[PDB]
Design a protein around this nucleic acid. Structure first.
Ligand SMILES: Nc1ncnc2c1ncn2[C@@H]1O[C@H](CSCC[C@H](N)C(=O)O)[C@@H](O)[C@H]1O
Ligand SMILES: Nc1ncnc2c1ncn2[C@@H]1O[C@H](CSCC[C@H](N)C(=O)O)[C@@H](O)[C@H]1O
Lengths: 194, 285, 285, 182
DNA sequence: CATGTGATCTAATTAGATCGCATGG
DNA sequence: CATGTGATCTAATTAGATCGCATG
């Protein structure tokens, strides 16, 4: 389902955030009004299905690898498995007709073995997003169509490899590139302003 | 009033096809037995001992969602993922998220893929097995990904060997009391070949390593044969596990190749107890 | 009339008790079966596969005439002495008078010790087996010491393997034409496990070494399995020799220890053909 | 009184000279090559009261292993035994000239159903013989050990080949069963 | 306070290649 | 002249001992 919404019938998006609070990203693009709609989960090792359900319905489920650093209490594959687990907890009942999106972003922390586990569990190969003025890059998995149809500067995973290894060795988030992946969602939900 | 249909089974990490063996032993008709397995010795055992009925699909990680819908539907999904990175007998275990431990999530993944959609109430049963001697953190995570708590079934109650195993699943009466059937050999002596005397009533947990056949940290020999100590023979190991005698006498396998197959597998009477109430849900005799 | 009685057998170099097996397959009642054998593997097979019926007496050279008098009388004396120093397949064969070749004279000696004295017309039968591929002089000396010529019986006529063997003895109709039983497996394909394809009708002579399992000087594999070449499994060797399947799945024996026992033994259908007329002389079930 | 002349079949060595020293259509039969001698051959060579066989001494003229002479000796001996209805006495004779090794020696005792008596000669060498006659095993003789006979066997290979000085001392107490020419 | 769906050491076996030639087909 | 109830040598694989310590 890749159908558009008329502007007058677009509701505010309900977002479930795991391993990152992307408030500042989503506010900066007019997805939330600045009142007192996004649930951030501290640690997912004990949240069951009833928890994701009682947190109200969700229109977008976001999870991301932490950037290159020591906040790896967990192995890099733990964030992916846990994201997939609660993603199924957050899927709408097969009768509901509203739009539903999910996305998982990798800051070049997963190695080759964790990357094939990534594309097999989420059932799509990653779209790698580069930052030119050659700074940083991210690979993303998501059902968002304009992240699969639009064409950013293609990069060899070997070019990414040199960077990746070099960046990992060099040892926050690339806000500019994660922000760009949210923009095609403005055509599906309510937009807010300043 | 609808007559029951033969069962269609998806068996991941099949091993030596204990699942199909127990189903046939119960008289349950089997329309499809699809097994993902990668060890050629195990595939040869299953191919031979079931006359090409099993259909092999290879690495569990090669099995996609599209494969599940082509080959499905499935009425029963069974499996026990490798535990060499889970069991605390290995001081070098890499955990649930590394090594072979992460192959558990392939089971959770294909189980999600094979589940009937919400609203479809056709009979669907699943069972996941692993060791009790695993890390507390790894058992918690297994239960959360499967959204069920396991039941502990020790093979010692219906066989001649200790084998405390965890079983996650939804099979009917999974937590009902264990019944010592007349077909069960409860003591080691009943599994020994002629002319040999057991030194223990029950034998300790049999791994794939030879040191598990000897008893305790003092490595006591299990049996006597004309006053000389001896380990268990392969046929005796099979009888301890509940397999037909010479079940694994296949493909010129060494003793240790046979024990590797048996040490990783299920206690047959335990699976028969778990599969038993399935015969009231599928075609029989 | 006078009713026939169970048979009493002295079996020298008994091996894996082919003699007792064939007698039981023929329904002949066996009062006692005394076996001289030294190989602990061979003794364990016989002890297990015949529930301690065989009485073992050990080295053939420790059996005196006094023992023959105490343990006898015997109605049947059978044996096939070691041929590793007799068969031309060993370029280091020490001949009939050295190495293990001289163990033939122990059969000649005990055959003399057990014969009925002149005037005693009680039925007495004996059989001595050995290879055709021996030297002219050695075969000549064997026939002079047993005072009769052998008959050449190739197991290829009743089995899936070449095995041209000499048989000395006085059994009824040792020269009668060899007929194919309908339970004989004449082609290699009939002896293979499921899912495997034979590349030959009959295989060459199986010895104790695995190069005899491959065919020709080119050492061709005998079997295809899913388009991969393979040698015979042990159960397939047993079927080729005519033994019950898993007959030698005993005592944690390796493929090599099992092929050593089979490579030295008799072709079961041949012995059945040779023993069959004994049914008219002794009590049968 | 009624003592008929003796009939002696010799194997692997003609005893004519030593037994004519006791005077014992010749009564003797000497066999060329036993390998093709069957039962009907020994049977048609008339009855025999004593059968004799011997190893060759340390030296050549022997293309056979030392064990060949015994097995053939044991074979044709039972060819020559008489039916139990025969009242005439029957005796056999096999003597070794130090060629038998240990492994070969036990084959002798087991196949002939008795261990050998050791007979020396000191001034030469020694011999050992198996036989049912009651005059060697019963009558006590010079008892030595097989180990000093081993030094005399190494002393045999040292020097070189004949045993007949002591061989004649064996066939002697047989004249009380056959004729005697003095 | 025993215990283990293993693994890493070793020294012991095993699998495959190779050698062998008198024999009766 | 293809064959063989074997034997030797050499990498390969098994036994068998020992090592581990979190957990129930
Ligand atoms: N990637 C993979 N895909 C499929 N099977 C695998 C695999 N990795 C390991 N396995 C298999 O998973 C099995 C786990 S042992 C379980 C066997 C089964 N319980 C029985 O009764 O026989 C092993 O046989 C192993 O060979
Ligand atoms: N000194 C001895 N005393 C008794 N048996 C012996 C022996 N030396 C070797 N043997 C045995 O003689 C056998 C010769 S192979 C014959 C086996 C038999 N025909 C069968 O059908 O199985 C071998 O099993 C060997 O172990």
């Amino acid at each position: 389902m890749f159908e558009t919404v008329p502007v007058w019938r677009r509701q505010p998006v309900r977002v479930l955030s795991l391993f990152e609070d992307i408030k500042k990203e989503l506010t900066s693009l007019g997805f939330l009004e600045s009142g007192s709609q996004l649930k951030h989960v501290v640690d997912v090792t004990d949240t069951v299905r009833k928890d994701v359900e009682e947190w109200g319905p969700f229109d977008l489920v976001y999870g991301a690898t932490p950037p290159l650093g020591h906040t790896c209490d967990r192995p890099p594959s733990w964030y992916l498995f846990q994201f997939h687990r609660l993603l199924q907890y957050a899927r709408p009942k097969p009768g509901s007709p509203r739009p539903f999106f999910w996305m998982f972003v990798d800051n070049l922390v997963l190695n080759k073995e964790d990357l094939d586990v990534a594309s097999r569990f989420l059932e799509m190969e990653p779209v790698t997003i580069p930052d030119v003025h050659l700074q940083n890059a991210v690979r993303v998995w998501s059902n968002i169509p304009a992240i699969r149809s639009r064409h950013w500067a293609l990069v060899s995973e070997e070019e990414l490899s040199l960077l990746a290894q070099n960046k990992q060795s060099s040892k926050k988030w690339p806000t500019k590139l994660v922000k760009n992946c949210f923009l095609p969602l403005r055509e599906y939900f309510k937009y807010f302003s300043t | 009033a609808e007559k029951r249909k033969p069962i269609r089974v998806l068996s991941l990490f099949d091993g030596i096809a204990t699942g199909l063996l127990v189903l046939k032993d119960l008289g349950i008709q089997v329309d499809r037995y699809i097994a993902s397995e990668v060890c050629e010795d195990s595939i040869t055992v299953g191919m031979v001992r079931h006359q090409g009925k099993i259909m092999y699909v290879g690495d569990v990680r090669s099995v996609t969602q599209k494969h599940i819908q082509e080959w499905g539907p499935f009425d029963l999904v069974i499996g026990g993922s490798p535990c060499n990175d889970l069991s605390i007998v290995n001081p070098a275990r890499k955990g649930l998220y590394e090594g072979t431990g992460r192959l558990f999530f392939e089971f959770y993944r294909l189980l999600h893929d094979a589940r009937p959609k919400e609203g479809d109430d056709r009979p669907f049963f699943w069972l996941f097995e692993n060791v009790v001697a695993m890390g507390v953190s790894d058992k918690r995570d297994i239960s959360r990904f499967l959204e069920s708590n396991p039941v502990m079934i020790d093979a010692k109650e219906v066989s001649a060997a200790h084998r405390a195993r965890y079983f996650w699943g939804n099979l009917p009466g999974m937590n009902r009391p264990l019944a010592s059937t007349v077909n069960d050999k409860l003591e080691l002596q009943e599994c020994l070949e002629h002319g040999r005397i057991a030194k223990f009533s029950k034998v300790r947990t049999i791994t794939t390593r030879s040191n598990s056949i000897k008893q305790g940290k003092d490595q006591h020999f299990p049996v006597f044969m004309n006053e000389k100590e001896d380990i268990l023979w392969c046929t005796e190991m099979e009888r301890v596990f509940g397999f037909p005698v010479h079940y694994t006498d296949v493909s010129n396998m060494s003793r240790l190749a046979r024990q590797r197959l048996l040490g990783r597998s299920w206690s047959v009477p335990v699976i028969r107890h778990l599969f038993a109430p399935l015969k009231e849900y599928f075609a029989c005799v």
